[PDB]
């Protein structure tokens, strides 16, 4: 069942990343210059993409870690897509707390196809076991990294954060990637 | 390569159809009662989903047929999704012209995963030929129909329109499905 995660990764590139990454720096600059609080640190460049290998993808990031707190939305990106006039692509900005204080600010989200792998393992008609789910999650991330390595749209625009939970700190995991830049 | 279209279909259900179909009747009623022109026909119930087996999915439906013309958007559906606060699900309403006159009004769009199958066949690193694309497109539609047949979310909410181009009239193809209701 190689083909499942392979297709989901290509889908994620074709239907999302290649569309939004080219416009993301401009959107962040606009946020930083026009909407961001005058007294706060700039939003980091780059979309940070969370890849939990157990495909546990909560809708609310504050569920996964208290130290990750919603700050604001970027300006919306819209475009006609497959018969939908002005389909909306939206991204959320988070503050990352270290010792009750802001250590970082970045555009952050989960790779939503990992939600599909999770659900497919829960639905009997999908014919996809829980054991194949880790293997698929890993294959998804490899394929995605292979794609972005060749992608002209990835111009230091994008950072993948793969992780496994065995207390694990997600905010620390993100701060580690954020400080490397 | 059974697994490609299989996963894309499940993804389409999990990440879209199961989320929007339950709320679609309410959204259409709201449009019909509050936003729709007093003197026009009601928008049909049901989301009409175009499935061109050649995976030719233009962004603008007026490209595919002059007689299909954008009228309006439904009210937006929003929800927190995978770390994105207020991700937007948007649908477009079209008028369908027969002899220069309005014969029908419906919420209409293409199945966007067919765009992924198309693009995957164009990108060398995807390892997916044009010949496998028809087979995958067919498998996508079968899997989707299998899912919706068991789906509690599909409550006469949803109509699949599969077709192949050999002049073919898309608006007629849609009017045929629309008049069956
Ligand atoms: N028409 C229509 N189809 C939709 C819509 N939303 C999802 N779908 C389709 O549902 C399936 C599963 O969705 P996922 O969210 O798990 O995966 C997505 C995640 C990412 O997209 C975004 C977009 C905005 N913000 C975050 N991520 C790329 C990937 C593929 O996205 P698509 O190529 O658009 O197709 C998908 C896919 O086939 C919609 O609003 N309209």
What tokens appear for A161 in the block? 């954060």
Residue with CA closest to ligand 1 atom 11: B12
CB atoms within 10 A of CB B36: 18
A100 part of contact set with chain B, CB < 8 Å: no
Nearest-atom index, ligand 1, CA of A87: 40
B111 part of contact set with chain A, CB < 8 Å: yes
Indicate the DSSP class of residue B66.
T
Question: Do the Cβ atoms of B43 and B32 come closer than 8 Å?
Answer: yes
- Measured between its terminal Cα atoms, the distance across chain B in Å is 36
Q: Which residues of chain B lie closer than 8 angstroms to A86, CB-CB?
A: 73, 90
Rounded to 10 degrees, the C-alpha dihedral A9/B12/B151/A57 comes to: 50
Q: Which residue blocks in chain B are alpha helix, DSSP H?
A: 3-12, 18-30, 61-64, 113-122, 131-150, 170-180
Give me the residue from A87, A109, A116 closest to B90, CB to CB. A87
What tokens appear for A176 in the block? 């580690």
**Separation of alpha carbons A128 and A43, rounded Å:** 39
Give A72's strand partners. Answer: A93
Beta carbon of A84 within 6 Å of any ligand 1 atom: yes
Question: Do the Cβ atoms of B82 and A59 come closer than 8 Å?
Answer: yes
* Residue in A19, A20, A8 with CA at minimum distance from that of residue A111: A8
Q: What does DSSP say about strands A68-73 and A92-98: parallel, antiparallel, or unpaired?
A: antiparallel
Question: How far is residue B115 from each of residues A57, A89, B127, measured CA to CA in Å?
Answer: 25, 17, 16
Question: Do the Cβ atoms of B140 and B27 come closer than 8 Å?
Answer: no
| Secondary-structure breakdown of chain A: helix, strand, coil percentages, each rounded to the nearest 5 | 45, 25, 30
Question: Do the Cβ atoms of B30 and B75 come closer than 8 Å?
Answer: yes
Question: Do the Cβ atoms of B33 and A46 come closer than 8 Å?
Answer: no
Q: Which H or E element spans position A133?
A: helix A131-150
Q: How far is B27 from chain A (nearest CA, A)?
A: 16
**Separation of alpha carbons B179 and B177, rounded Å:** 6
C-alpha B85 chain-centroid distance: 25
If 0-12 CB within 10 Å is exposed, 13-18 middle and 19+ buried, where does residue B67 land? buried
Question: Do the Cβ atoms of B174 and B63 come closer than 8 Å?
Answer: no
Give B161's strand partners. Answer: B50
Length of chain B measured in residues: 181
**Separation of alpha carbons B94 and A57, rounded Å:** 35
If 0-12 CB within 10 Å is exposed, 13-18 middle and 19+ buried, where does residue B167 land? exposed
Give B68's strand partners. Answer: B96
């Amino acid at each position: 069942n190689f083909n499942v995660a392979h297709g989901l990764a290509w889908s994620y590139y074709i239907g999302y990343l290649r569309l939004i990454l080219p416009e993301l720096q401009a959107r962040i600059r606009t946020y930083n210059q026009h909407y961001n609080n005058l007294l706060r640190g700039a939003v980091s460049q780059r979309l940070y993409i969370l890849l939990p290998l157990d495909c546990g993808v909560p809708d609310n990031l504050s569920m996964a870690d208290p130290n990750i707190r919603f700050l604001d939305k970027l300006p919306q990106q819209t475009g006609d897509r497959a018969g939908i006039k002005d389909r909306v692509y939206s991204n959320s900005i988070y503050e990352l707390l270290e010792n009750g204080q802001r250590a970082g600010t970045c555009v952050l989200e989960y790779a939503t196809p990992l939600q599909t792998l999770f659900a497919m393992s829960q639905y009997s008609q999908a014919g996809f076991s829980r054991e194949d789910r880790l293997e698929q999650a890993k294959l998804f991330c490899r394929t995605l990294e292979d794609i972005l390595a060749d992608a002209p749209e990835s111009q230091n625009n994008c950072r993948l954060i793969a992780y496994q939970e065995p207390s694990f700190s997600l905010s620390q995991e993100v701060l580690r990637h954020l400080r490397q830049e």
